[PDB]
Amino acid sequence: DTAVLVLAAGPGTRMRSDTPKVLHTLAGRSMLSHVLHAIAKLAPQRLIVVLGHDHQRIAPLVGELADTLGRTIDVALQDRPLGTGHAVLCGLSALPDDYAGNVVVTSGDTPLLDADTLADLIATHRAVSAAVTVLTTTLDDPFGYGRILRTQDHEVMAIVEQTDATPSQREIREVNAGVYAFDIAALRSALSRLSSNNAQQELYLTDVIAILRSDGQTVHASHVDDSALVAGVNNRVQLAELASELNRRVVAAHQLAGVTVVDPATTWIDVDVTIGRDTVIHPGTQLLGRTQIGGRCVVGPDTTLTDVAVGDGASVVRTHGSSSSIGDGAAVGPFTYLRPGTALGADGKLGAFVEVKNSTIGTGTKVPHLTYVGDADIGEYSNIGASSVFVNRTTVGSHVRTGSDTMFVAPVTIGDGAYTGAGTVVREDVPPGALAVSAGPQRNIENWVQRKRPGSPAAQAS
Amino acid sequence: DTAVLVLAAGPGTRMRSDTPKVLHTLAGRSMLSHVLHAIAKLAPQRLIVVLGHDHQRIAPLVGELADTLGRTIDVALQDRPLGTGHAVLCGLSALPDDYAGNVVVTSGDTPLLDADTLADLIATHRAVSAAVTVLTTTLDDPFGYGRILRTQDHEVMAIVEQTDATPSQREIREVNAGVYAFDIAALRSALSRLSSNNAQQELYLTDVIAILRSDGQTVHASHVDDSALVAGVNNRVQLAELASELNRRVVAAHQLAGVTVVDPATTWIDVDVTIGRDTVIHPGTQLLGRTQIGGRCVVGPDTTLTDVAVGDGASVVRTHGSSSSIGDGAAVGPFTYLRPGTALGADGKLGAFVEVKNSTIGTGTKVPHLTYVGDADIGEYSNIGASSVFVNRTTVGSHVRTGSDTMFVAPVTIGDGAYTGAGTVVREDVPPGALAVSAGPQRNIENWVQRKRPGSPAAQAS
Amino acid sequence: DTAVLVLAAGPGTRMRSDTPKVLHTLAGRSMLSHVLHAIAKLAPQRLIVVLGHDHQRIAPLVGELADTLGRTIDVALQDRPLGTGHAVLCGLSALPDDYAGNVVVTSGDTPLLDADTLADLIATHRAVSAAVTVLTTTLDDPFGYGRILRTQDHEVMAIVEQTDATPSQREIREVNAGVYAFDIAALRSALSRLSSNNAQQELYLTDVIAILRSDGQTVHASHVDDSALVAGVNNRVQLAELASELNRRVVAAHQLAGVTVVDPATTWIDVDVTIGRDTVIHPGTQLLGRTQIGGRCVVGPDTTLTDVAVGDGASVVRTHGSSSSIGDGAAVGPFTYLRPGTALGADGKLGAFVEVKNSTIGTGTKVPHLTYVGDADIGEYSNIGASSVFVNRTTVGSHVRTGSDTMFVAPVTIGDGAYTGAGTVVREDVPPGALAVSAGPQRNIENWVQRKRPGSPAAQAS
Ligand SMILES: CC(=O)N[C@H]1[C@@H](OP(=O)(O)OP(=O)(O)OC[C@H]2O[C@@H](n3ccc(=O)[nH]c3=O)[C@H](O)[C@@H]2O)O[C@H](CO)[C@@H](O)[C@@H]1O
Ligand SMILES: CC(=O)N[C@H]1[C@@H](OP(=O)(O)OP(=O)(O)OC[C@H]2O[C@@H](n3ccc(=O)[nH]c3=O)[C@H](O)[C@@H]2O)O[C@H](CO)[C@@H](O)[C@@H]1O
Ligand SMILES: CC(=O)N[C@H]1[C@@H](OP(=O)(O)OP(=O)(O)OC[C@H]2O[C@@H](n3ccc(=O)[nH]c3=O)[C@H](O)[C@@H]2O)O[C@H](CO)[C@@H](O)[C@@H]1O
Ligand SMILES: [Co+2]
């Protein structure tokens, strides 16, 4: 029986942002959504988020996350950020006065924390019957973290903040994860003896360690070897660091499952993208949102995709694209732009310097050069000539061949098997199997250059 | 007198691939082709590759590599993958029963191994008169490697596999390279006493170390400090790692020879690309295949080239290109696509949003904007107007100036010094020094917008 | 009272370059300009640069840097590169014979050295009253550096060059920064006893350490913990290394000030670029020269900008651009090319496959597709149709709407609120609120395909 509190009420000063810290993203999810997903998995009885300026967030919690995760998540308010000890107090008010379960406390700013780390904490805390168990790690650069102070016997004495004591002695490398389990009555008790006479002048949660030690209670510290699972984010340097470690691990999972990623350091893959066996991802690539790739694909160099579905055996090279689908064996790129609502059928082709927006394109159809296709629908085994524009719902049949430089002034229907001359402005329906034209005839004006440009190419018309 | 065996018969389970492991590529060559190139250099008397599912490969060996390397390479078959000890046995059947030379054994999955490492092995093995010499290295992460066990006196006792013994004690960091020299009779002998009662239930080559130790033979282990030269690839994580270390070294060689590479971490250069003094390679660049760059070039950001020859003093910026040539002082990019058979002469120019396919383009000719050129040939000091298309063999002369938006419906010949109006559809030959036109005349319809769009721009026609 | 000498007279052999080593760039400035900027800040009384082949440089010093830094910088000549000790001698000739200040000596090839490191050196040198103080650091890879040799008591004895002594014993990891302070008379004195009997056969500055030790003078060595501030560049491998460390630090400064940089390892930012709070820089991006970004911008993936000003809240995605301005809330990209003299007004739009050169574009104007705009000026809330070309000063009014595939043959004036049909060649002024057209009428030729292509699309016109 446990209640979990997420502390998300701080000002996030060092982010230098008008966006609340806990809303800052990595791998496709805000830090708060990473944290709330880990806990939901653990499925505790009670789950509580402590908010300050409550409206720019209260909305995303529950409103997007408790429904999605299919559980209740309570919001508790802390009006002024008096400290992590004061934040816990406010979290406790959402529990009944007679609450008897355990209390787990975590920060909204530790995004790699996972269910398992949380479940072992709870299990250690029960196993040793502790008043407080705290997760610790060891780090080469310990700055900003509260340091674990141990007695002569390796007993946890206290936690000391960066700003406070450990004067010169900050050299300590065993750090506080900011992740705890507590007996409730020992928690209510220690919090009532908190004072704010310290370098930050705040009610620190960390002080509770030394206070329960004084009442000869049991304090257990529990070392997490994989430091990244408990790393904090207080600034944008630490954010990009952890984003990058999370990326390495998501890439590694895909590799081990049968995906060749040529260059992991420049391959960004959101948590949620799926990618099938034997596809190849070339450097300089981001796969974002709910993107899905089948097997045997080539994801070429310099491709950005957000919510794009790509079937088996398709090629997607230097493409910028979102909210679109690309069929089996289709070819896309290089230098191609897909806007939302693009659907390209199996074995379809979108070539170099082509943009498609809100359009349907049938199996084995080809748009290879320098063309814009918007709000149009196109059948199968058709061919759209180079340097053309769908001007905006235009309907094009199957096995159509349109000429280079045709303009389609919406709405127009071009029948199956129809053709269009090069340089045609199409303004009316074209029956099946007709040829549509508008360009006037070629007229050659002899010796024009000798007369009108008497230098350069004037030799050699000579 | 030595015979070299390459073991390439395993199932490659952890690659999760329908492509045989040994065919997986890095820096432009399969692991098997890296390995076979190193040995060819050493030039042993006999060279033997052990294959299993023999047809998807037997083809590339000899068929591409023994001819290319100009030596004989024998294939020996091992039908079922009973173990690296069973693989060696099958390799031995390609040697005469009375064979008396030394036997070198290596894996098809150690691609950075070089002639020199191999030559020192053979020399140590002769020098110390050993029954077996084995190459070892030391590693921070030793997982998957067989561990070297040494007596109290640093004598090699045995090799132990990851799956087997070293229970907790796997902490050992001295690893087996999988690269050996053997006396033949001691090799035939130890292999005949191999059993498969082990965690994998296989006939391990590694066991031969302990067996010859038991017959008080000489076992020499030889430490390779540069660990990368003997690193194995069992999965796609290890593949991308080693691909990346090989890349760093190929980049470093080019830098030391007089090439500025702005960002090595994002510059991929195949082994085989040549690059001349004082050129500059900007970030996000891959130079692949048999690509060649002269001196004083700029290789701009985000350029991909496969089998592209670029002369001195040329510029190639954000270009995607293959099987093509670019003359001295030519400018290409940004946002340019070259398809096979593109030849651009000295001081030529292909600009932004231009594609060229199977075309010849003469010295000092310019195609700067938004145009497609396919299966066409073009003389010197000509100028192809923006937003044009060569529709498919078209022939264009020297000092031609064609108008913006001209369509060339193949086959058509445009004489030297000829011009074309803007918006011309060219369907017939254009004599030298003629002007070709087809666009009809401008007609202005006054106050059209007041009448037909009574809002917006209707003020201010006001 | 100090005089500072920069030694820049060497041949730079290992750069394998026809460009003098000291002119090689990182983060937007030559190594010499990094070095001269650090010293200028310190503001010494005298500042002297030692040059050899004097003309390819003497020009940039003073000529660009002493004016810019608003101080005098003297050039002293050393005709042949006899050594760093001989270089100092030549530097001294630019001081009066009776000069009595201190003498600071540094290399033109240590580009991260900063004013502060220099000011603490001078202060240590005064504080301890030393004859020579030398800056040292400690390094994992010590190759090419002169090693600090200390007595049994940690007293600096001598400096030994890589090429010379420390035979096997080169294992020493405490290195010479090449940055010194000297008493002038002790400097004149030690230099007069220099000989060139050594592995390089040169007059080494380093020998002066041992010589003043012999005259029982005071030799102080001063350890710099941040090794990068005193790292040298003798080859292009070391150059790209230090360029990359300088980049990491410039990125970090921007992050800590309120800029999200998704991927630091692939974000190049010149020293001098300014970037405002809450903007987001996506991977694969270079911001170069005097580029300026406001707040709330998105700098999308694969953007290169050199001297580009971007206001607040603008979007710049996969754009290659230079010497141009982009207004507040404007959208640019993806796949856009800006050439010098491009000015786009607030809330303007340049879309995919658009190039703009030397053009003015007013507030809320839109050029979204496949168009070239050169030497043209365009008012506000206008719309330039897809696949169009400004052919070269063309003037376009406000609230104009031009049709897809319009060619504007410069010089032409299009009045406010005017329209243009699709496929129009505009050769004469268009009054305000007129419609301009030239395309002829659509003609449909029935059953053409059955007759002229009797296969394929011939079914199904069937
Ligand atoms: C005093 C304290 O607990 N310090 C811990 C905190 O340091 P650190 O310096 O972060 O303390 P933070 O300011 O980020 O606060 C911790 C978390 O508590 C929330 N918050 C903060 C203040 C407030 O009044 N109300 C509130 O709800 C914040 O939103 C944040 O998510 O986490 C570190 C690990 O990352 C630990 O090593 C520190 O020991
Ligand atoms: C038992 C054995 O030798 N283990 C060694 C092997 O480990 P490792 O676990 O790789 O053994 P692998 O499965 O990759 O096999 C080694 C090589 O032998 C070939 N092969 C394998 C099985 C088979 O029945 N037939 C066959 O020809 C494979 O194709 C491969 O190229 O290489 C490592 C270094 O990389 C060493 O540290 C291990 O000590
Ligand atoms: C003998 C000497 O001083 N060696 C030092 C030099 O090594 P290092 O091997 O560089 O000596 P370099 O050849 O780069 O010379 C040092 C600097 O002096 C200038 N120069 C050189 C030769 C010459 O005749 N005239 C001249 O003006 C060069 O342009 C360069 O900027 O710097 C290192 C740190 O980077 C130190 O660890 C070495 O102890
Ligand atoms: Co690009």
Ligand SMILES: [Mg+2]
């Ligand atoms: Mg924090």
Ligand SMILES: [Mg+2]
């Ligand atoms: Mg292996």
Ligand SMILES: [Mg+2]
């Ligand atoms: Mg140097």
